[PDB]
C-alpha cells in the first residue's frame, strides 16, 4: 500500500484524526487485542506473530503477557522497516501516537517510553515466515510456542480454502499442544466484490471455525468486532 512500507505507515498509522476510518479500525482491533491478552488471560513465555508487516500495534498489549516475542513476515522490506524501529534508528516511524493510545486503553498505568521499552525487550528474533510452507519459518529452529498470533494475514496469504486449511496446520507445527492460536481477520461480504472469496455475514463464521477444527485445534472463543472477527483457538 501507498508507495512502499514506510509511506503505508505514514498514510495510515499516525493517528492524526480519531474519526478517520483507519483510526476507527485500529481502535476496534486494539480494544480486542487488549481483551484477548489482558482480560481473557492469554499469557505465556513465547509468542510468534505471523505476518506482522511493518507494524507493531498488534503487539503492544501482547508484550505484557509474553516473556518473549518473535515477529515474522513474508516481505523482507517490511522486516527492515520494523527493525529500524526496534533498533531505535534515527528515521524510524514514530509509533508514539498508537503507543500512547494503547497506554491509555490500559488505564494510563505506564507512559509511552516504558511501553516501547517493554516491547523491545520482548522482541529478539525477526524472521521470514511463509504460511504456505510446511515449515512456516523454513530452516529457523524454534522452541514450541505458547501462542501464534496472526492478524489480517492468512486470509490474504491464502487464495484457496485448501491452502487456508493447510496454512493453519503448518502454523500448528510451531505450537505446544495446549498453546494458543489467535486469529484476526475480515470476513468480507459479497457487496461490490470482484471475483470470488473462500467464506461468506453470520454463516461464514461457521466455515472458518470448521477449517480450524479440521486443522487440529479447538475453538475457545469467536467474536465479531466489513466483518472483522477474533478467533482464539487451542492446539490439540
Amino acid at each position: 500500500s501507498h508507495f512502499n512500507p514506510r509511506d503505508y505507515l505514514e498514510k495510515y498509522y499516525k493517528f492524526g484524526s480519531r474519526h478517520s476510518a483507519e483510526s476507527q479500525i485500529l481502535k476496534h482491533l486494539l480494544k480486542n487485542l487488549f481483551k484477548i491478552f489482558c482480560l481473557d488471560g492469554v499469557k505465556g513465555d513465547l509468542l510468534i506473530d505471523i505476518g506482522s508487516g511493518p507494524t507493531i500495534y498488534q503487539l503492544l498489549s501482547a508484550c505484557e503477557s509474553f516473556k518473549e516475542i518473535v515477529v515474522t513476515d513474508y516481505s523482507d522490506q517490511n522486516l527492515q522497516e520494523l527493525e529500524k524501529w526496534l533498533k531505535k534508528e534515527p528515521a524510524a516511524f514514530d509509533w508514539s501516537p498508537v503507543v500512547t493510545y494503547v497506554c491509555d486503553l490500559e488505564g494510563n498505568r505506564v507512559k509511552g517510553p516504558e511501553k516501547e521499552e517493554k516491547l523491545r525487550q520482548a522482541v529478539k528474533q525477526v524472521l521470514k515466515c511463509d504460511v504456505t510452507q510446511s515449515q512456516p519459518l523454513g530452516a529457523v529452529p524454534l522452541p514450541p510456542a505458547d501462542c501464534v498470533l496472526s492478524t489480517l494475514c492468512l486470509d490474504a496469504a491464502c487464495p484457496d480454502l485448501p491452502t487456508y486449511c493447510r496454512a493453519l496446520r503448518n502454523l500448528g507445527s510451531l505450537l505446544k499442544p495446549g498453546g494458543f492460536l489467535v486469529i484476526m481477520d475480515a470476513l468480507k461480504s459479497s457487496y461490490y466484490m470482484i471475483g470470488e472469496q473462500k467464506f461468506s455475514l453470520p454463516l461464514g463464521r461457521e466455515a472458518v471455525e470448521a477449517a480450524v477444527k479440521e486443522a487440529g485445534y479447538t475453538i475457545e472463543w469467536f467474536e465479531v468486532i466489513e466483518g472483522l472477527f477474533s478467533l482464539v483457538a487451542r492446539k490439540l
Binding site: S1, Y8, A21, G53, P54, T55, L152, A156
Partner: peptide
Amino acid sequence: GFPYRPXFC
C-alpha cells in the same frame, strides 16, 4: 490495503 499490510494491501 488498510487494514491489510504490504504486500497484501
